[PDB]
Ligand binder design. Structure first.
Ligand code: B4J
Ligand code: B4J
Lengths: 352, 384
């Protein structure tokens, strides 16, 4: 550990996209500091005042040069969540079409929990898997966190099940794609915890890709509303497979296995699954098995596809697209330092 | 477009951005502040990673301190050797506590830039600038010949030597003026000598950038009581408008002291010196005996007058054209290439014979009960 060796080691940390002290993450620190200090009450402090005087125009210049919401033309809102929305966007300069997820910093600060997105960021950006929705850019302003992802024109599997009477042949395909998709997540050292058809999106070819990773959690050393498993409602990766069985049941029956008009009713039905759980014999066998060993099950035995070439085969529903923007498959001032921008330092990612 | 992240003169350069995070971790890591969930969780995420950064980056521990070779108001200068490269340097330390306590924690910026980007043989080179929660560190080139105060005390300086050192100061100050600065504290303590015995200016802590008409507006008197000019000495709110001629006054003070052995406005009482500078018309007297020539007396008097009639007012060429500098040994354009009057006898790369010994004695910031940001005036100081 003697420089220029430790100088090279320092230079690697500034260039690495996976690094928390990366050039883009360091700019976030100064950007957040300027946002959180620029108030008349705080400017009474000579240290705060003079720091802001020096990094005044230069941070405004940085804000102009860096990626912002103004660089994207919003076509239409294609999704909504608890803390934000997903909009179909087109980059004004490149004319490239994307899906932009927005997360309200106000809501993340108000009702606490402002760390859920860190899992979603690392998964979507560093997966490099055909089973995960790719994150091209991540940026932020004083109000929102923005996630520029690849657009999925095929829509979600909730929309597919509502528009089609799903046969067992189709059910075999989509379940198998989810199995391969979840295995990639586990291989990355993560557990989904919210496997559902709303989080299963289809591309232009009609193939599955997992989304909404705001419920994920990184595994330790060894690996430790109806879709929830009894263990969650210390555990391994086997908890996500329960939700696969829930998904397979709903796909073939048309209703969730533990449905109740009262949410508390579903909770009691999940805990009593042994007496609560009420097509073919092998499909029923798989649902009950969840309620390589998954891949070896008789339900997946077919003459159309193979596990290693499944994504290369023709999907059951290939979306009819007219354009690159086709959406037919979609329906206080502080009196002292508070540091509201601090939980969001290091969110900015660009790739290449 | 990322020119702002690569440029060493940029305030948003990679090293300056790290300072922001480093300062934030220092200023937020207190139990009272950690009660805030935003501050607590930010510090939890950038915990180990900032400690890793602190280990990888340049620190005081990378340098082996040989001995203290200088002392200032806000710090000290120590002869150091880099532990890894074994390279010998002079490290200036500036107390963040003293800068915050006494206010005025912005003097070092122009000093950092002048030493770093002058690229002149007349200016002491700054190789590295770094910091911790307590000090600002300035890794500079070591000047083994010492200061001109030490030279005048150890030698009975003749006029031939006086002609050389005055001429080197003239060329040195002209370079600082060409960079758009007024020194404001020209004295022999700030005049250092290299291994060859040639002059280099140091301590640019009083330096101020001139406007397009070479002027400066300052409401506070700056410099040393013996070397200060009348225009700078009497500066106050409303009346503090002066040019580069104030540096030339100090040259005349330096030339007088070199030949006489005493400052021209010396007094045992400091206010006596103040009075003597303001009354320079009747105060400037040469010792009765006389041996210091007619042209040397002419130069001292040409500098030691009111600004409007002071030599140098019409540029540096009128100073260079003075009869005192007329000699048969050197020329203005080749002066630094000629052999110096005193070439230091050096036994080792860590020879401190030309520096006197210094004695010993710190204070720290109280724990904050709310955010104070004591590290904020020092963000961006890190260089190379
Ligand atoms: C490229 O295609 C897409 C990729 C992902 C998504 C997606 O993600 N949708 C759900 C969503 C959207 C917006 C906000 C939130 C949200 O607030 N999600 C939240 N999750 C948690 C919150 S708020 C608070 N906390 C209790 C922990 C978990 C969720 C949509 C897409 O388009 C179809
Ligand atoms: C290459 O070798 C050397 C290079 C530079 C120096 C040097 O520079 N010495 C003066 C000095 C040293 C330490 C601190 C300060 C200081 O506190 N300087 C200060 N300047 C100002 C302050 S405190 C506050 N304010 C009154 C206005 C400007 C001054 C010495 C060297 O060799 C011995």
């Amino acid at each position: 550990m003697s420089f220029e060796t430790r100088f090279e080691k320092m230079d690697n940390l500034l260039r690495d996209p996976k690094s928390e002290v990366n050039s883009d993450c360091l700019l976030d620190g100064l950007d957040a500091l300027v946002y959180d200090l620029d108030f008349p009450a705080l400017r009474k402090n000579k240290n705060i005042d003079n720091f802001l005087s020096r990094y005044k125009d230069t941070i405004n210049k940085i804000r102009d040069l860096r990626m912002k919401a103004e660089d994207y033309e919003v076509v239409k809102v294609i999704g909504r969540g608890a803390f934000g929305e997903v909009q179909l966007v087109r980059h004004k300069s490149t004319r490239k079409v994307y899906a932009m997820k927005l997360l309200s910093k106000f809501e993340m600060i108000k009702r606490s929990d402002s760390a859920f997105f860190w899992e979603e960021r690392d998964i979507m950006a560093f997966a490099n898997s055909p089973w995960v929705v790719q994150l091209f850019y991540a940026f932020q302003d004083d109000r929102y966190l923005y996630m520029v992802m690849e657009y999925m024109p095929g829509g979600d599997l909730v929309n597919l099940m509502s528009n089609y009477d799903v046969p067992e042949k189709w059910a075999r395909f989509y379940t198998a794609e989810v199995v391969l998709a979840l295995d990639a997540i586990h291989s990355m050292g993560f557990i989904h915890r919210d496997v559902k058809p709303d989080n299963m999106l289809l591309d232009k070819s009609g193939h599955l890709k997992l989304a909404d990773f705001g419920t994920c959690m990184k595994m330790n050393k060894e690996g430790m509303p109806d879709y929830i498993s009894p263990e969650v409602l210390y555990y391994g990766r086997e908890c996500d497979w329960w939700s696969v069985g829930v998904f397979l049941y709903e796909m073939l029956v048309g209703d969730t296995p533990f449905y109740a008009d009262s949410l508390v009713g579903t909770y009691s039905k999940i805990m009593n699954h042994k007496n609560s759980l009420t097509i073919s014999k092998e499909a029923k066998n798989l649902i009950c098995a969840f309620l390589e060993e998954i891949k070896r099950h008789l339900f997946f035995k077919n003459d159309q596809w193979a596990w290693e070439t499944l994504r290369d085969t023709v999907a059951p529903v290939v979306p009819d697209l007219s354009s690159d923007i086709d959406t037919s498959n979609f329906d206080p001032i502080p009196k002292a330092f508070v540091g509201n921008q601090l939980p969001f330092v290091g969110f900015t990612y660009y790739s290449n």
